[PDB]
Design a protein around this ligand. Structure first.
Ligand SMILES: N[C@@H](CCS)C(=O)O
Ligand SMILES: [Zn+2]
Ligand SMILES: [Zn+2]
Ligand SMILES: [Zn+2]
Length: 288
C-alpha cells in the first residue's frame, strides 16, 4: 500500500490541482479535450514544470495528465494503441521526473507519490457525460476501453491509479474487476454525484461503497470535480459508510477554508480539481 507510510505519519495527504490552468498561464492553447496528445508531444517540459510547481506548493501526490488519454480517444488523432500507450506512459514519466527534481532540491520533502489518472468512459464521449453517467457498455467493452491505459500507467511506474470523476456504477464494477488482473495495482475511486447520497447515474452511494469494499486493491474512496458547497455533505455521508481514507478534490470556488470540516469527515487525501492552481495547494499546506 503506497498510502500507508504517509498515512502512518500524518493525518492529511495533499494532492495536486488542475493541470490546464497552469499550462494556459504558460501560453498553451488547449483547444479541445485531446489537448494532452499535443502537449505531451510538443511541450512535455511544461507538464513536468507544472508537476514540479505543485510539489513545491506542498502536494505529496501528482496526478498524471492521462485523464483523456486512451487509445479510443487518441484514435481521432491518428494514433494506434501502442502510440497511445507511449503517450500515457510519458505522462507518468514526466511526473516522476518532476519528483526527482523536487527531491534533489528538497530531500527532506518526505515520500512523494505519482498517481496515474484514469478518467471515465464519459470523458471520451466528450459530451459532458462524466457528470450524468447515462451510457451503456458491456463489462467487456468497459474493460477493453480501460485496459490499455491501466497497463501503460502501471508499466511506466505509477504508484497508484486515480480512477476519478466516475459517474457510472456498471463502469465502476468493470474497473474494480479489471484491477484484480494486476495484483500489484492499488487505486482510489473518486465519484461525481447527483446529490449528497447518489452517484451521477442514480446509484445510492451505500451500494457503491458496499461493492468496492470487496476489493482490497481499492485503498481510498471519495469525490472530485464537484462544487465546493456540495463537498461536506457528501463526505459526511461516506464517513458513515466506510473508514477507508476519503478523497476530496473539488472545483475552485475558499477551498482551503474547508480543510477542518473535511478532515473531521474522514478526508485524508485533499487537493483541487477544475480551475484550481498551486495557490490552492499552498493554502491547504498552510492550514494543515
Ligand atoms: N484531469 C483531471 C480530472 C478532470 S475532472 C485530473 O486528472 O485530476
Ligand atoms: Zn441509459
Ligand atoms: Zn458481458
Ligand atoms: Zn474536475
Amino acid at each position: 500500500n503506497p498510502l500507508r507510510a504517509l498515512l502512518d505519519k500524518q493525518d492529511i495527504l495533499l494532492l495536486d490541482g488542475a493541470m490546464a490552468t497552469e499550462l494556459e498561464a504558460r501560453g498553451c492553447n488547449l483547444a479541445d479535450s485531446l489537448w494532452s496528445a499535443k502537449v505531451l508531444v510538443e511541450n512535455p517540459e511544461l507538464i513536468r514544470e507544472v508537476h514540479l510547481d505543485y510539489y513545491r506548493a506542498g502536494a505529496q501526490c501528482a496526478i498524471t495528465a492521462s485523464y483523456q488519454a486512451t487509445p479510443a480517444g487518441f484514435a481521432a488523432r491518428g494514433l494506434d494503441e501502442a502510440q497511445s500507450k507511449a503517450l500515457i506512459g510519458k505522462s507518468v514519466e514526466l511526473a516522476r521526473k518532476a519528483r526527482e527534481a523536487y527531491l534533489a532540491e528538497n530531500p527532506q520533502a518526505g515520500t512523494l507519490l505519482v498517481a496515474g489518472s484514469v478518467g471515465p468512459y464519459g470523458a471520451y464521449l466528450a459530451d459532458g457525460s462524466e457528470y450524468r453517467g447515462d451510457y451503456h457498455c458491456s463489462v467487456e467493452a468497459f474493460q477493453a476501453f480501460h485496459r490499455p491505459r491501466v497497463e501503460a500507467l502501471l508499466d511506466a511506474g505509477a504508484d497508484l491509479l486515480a480512477c476519478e470523476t466516475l459517474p457510472n456504477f456498471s463502469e465502476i464494477e468493470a474497473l474494480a474487476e479489471l484491477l484484480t488482473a494486476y495484483p500489484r495495482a492499488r487505486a482510489w475511486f473518486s465519484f461525481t454525484l447527483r446529490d449528497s447520497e447518489h452517484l451521477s447515474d442514480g446509484t445510492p452511494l451505500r451500494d457503491v461503497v458496499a461493492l468496492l469494499a470487496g476489493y482490497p486493491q481499492v485503498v481510498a474512496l471519495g469525490i472530485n470535480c464537484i462544487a465546493l458547497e456540495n463537498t461536506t455533505a457528501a463526505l459526511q455521508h461516506l464517513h458513515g459508510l466506510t473508514v477507508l481514507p476519503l478523497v476530496v478534490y473539488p472545483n475552485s470556488g475558499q477551498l482551503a477554508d474547508y480543510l477542518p470540516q473535511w478532515q473531521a469527515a474522514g478526508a485524508r487525501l485533499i487537493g483541487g480539481c477544475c480551475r484550481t492552481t498551486p495557490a490552492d495547494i499552498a493554502a491547504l499546506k498552510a492550514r494543515s
